Design an enzyme around this catalytic site. Structure first.
Site, mmCIF file in Angstrom:
data_model
loop_
_atom_site.group_PDB
_atom_site.id
_atom_site.type_symbol
_atom_site.label_atom_id
_atom_site.label_comp_id
_atom_site.label_asym_id
_atom_site.label_seq_id
_atom_site.Cartn_x
_atom_site.Cartn_y
_atom_site.Cartn_z
ATOM 1 N N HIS A 40 0.831 -1.239 0.000
ATOM 2 C CA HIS A 40 0.000 0.000 0.000
ATOM 3 C C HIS A 40 0.853 1.273 0.000
ATOM 4 O O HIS A 40 0.337 2.392 -0.155
ATOM 5 C CB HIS A 40 -1.020 0.028 1.171
ATOM 6 C CG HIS A 40 -0.427 0.211 2.547
ATOM 7 N ND1 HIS A 40 0.220 -0.774 3.234
ATOM 8 C CD2 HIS A 40 -0.399 1.307 3.353
ATOM 9 C CE1 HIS A 40 0.612 -0.283 4.405
ATOM 10 N NE2 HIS A 40 0.262 0.984 4.533
ATOM 11 N N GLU A 71 0.558 -8.130 2.139
ATOM 12 C CA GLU A 71 0.896 -6.696 2.169
ATOM 13 C C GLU A 71 2.419 -6.511 1.991
ATOM 14 O O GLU A 71 3.022 -5.516 2.413
ATOM 15 C CB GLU A 71 0.353 -6.102 3.500
ATOM 16 C CG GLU A 71 0.451 -4.598 3.653
ATOM 17 C CD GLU A 71 -0.175 -3.853 2.519
ATOM 18 O OE1 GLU A 71 -1.387 -4.007 2.275
ATOM 19 O OE2 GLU A 71 0.541 -3.089 1.864
ATOM 20 N N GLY A 144 2.588 4.499 11.331
ATOM 21 C CA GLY A 144 3.347 5.282 10.382
ATOM 22 C C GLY A 144 4.709 4.675 10.059
ATOM 23 O O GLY A 144 5.440 5.200 9.222
ATOM 24 N N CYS A 146 5.657 2.164 8.321
ATOM 25 C CA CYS A 146 5.575 1.243 7.193
ATOM 26 C C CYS A 146 6.968 0.941 6.629
ATOM 27 O O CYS A 146 7.674 1.829 6.182
ATOM 28 C CB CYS A 146 4.658 1.802 6.110
ATOM 29 S SG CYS A 146 2.955 2.053 6.658
#
Length: 182
Positions: A40, A71, A144, A146
């Site tokens: 994403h 993911e 946050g 990621c």
């Protein structure tokens, strides 16, 4: 402790900043030119590595065949120098071990945050989105991170793909995914 020093050593070794659509996050090199990043975050076919335009050779959007989200995206970046194979340093033994979340983004410049003992979620859904092979640690994280390298001393557990609230969701980077030829 030793986890923190390892993180700094892994940092200079296989960690770099990747400018994706979501922002400049942490990219972990696995071996050779094989790197890994969340999905994403939206990495392009060509991406900016530390701001430098670079093209991706091979792009493996890694999810479960049945459209279940891991993911995770494994990509072979076209770089001359090779990443040190930290594949034998992969810890597919997860649950019960204390893990440290090492995030190196443009914002989070090497934030080594000890999160505690990680546990295995397995296949769970997150708001109807089915996720398979997630490693989950119960820790109120300020979302946050990621691409956050979830590691310990000589142990890569995986990467924080997208945790929220008390559930830090990391993808299980098992050596199986990095087996070149099966």
């Amino acid at each position: 402790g030793p986890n923190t020093e390892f993180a700094l050593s892994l940092l200079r070794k296989n960690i770099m900043t990747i400018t994706t659509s979501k922002g400049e996050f942490t990219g972990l090199g696995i071996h050779d030119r094989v790197c890994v990043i969340p999905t994403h975050a939206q990495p392009g076919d060509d991406v900016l590595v530390n701001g430098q335009k670079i093209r991706v050779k091979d792009k493996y959007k890694l999810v479960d065949p049945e459209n279940i989200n891991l993911e995770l995206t494994v990509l072979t970046l076209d770089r001359n120098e090779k990443f040190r194979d930290i594949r034998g340093f992969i810890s597919e033994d997860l649950e019960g071990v204390d893990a440290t979340l090492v995030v190196h983004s443009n914002n989070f410049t090497n934030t080594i945050l000890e999160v505690g003992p990680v546990t295995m979620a397995g296949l769970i859904n997150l708001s109807s989105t089915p996720t398979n092979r997630m490693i989950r640690y119960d820790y109120a994280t300020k979302t946050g991170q990621c691409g956050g390298v979830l590691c310990a001393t000589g142990k890569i557990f995986g990467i924080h793909v997208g945790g929220n609230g008390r559930q830090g969701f990391s993808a299980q980077l098992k050596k199986q995914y990095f087996v070149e030829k099966q």
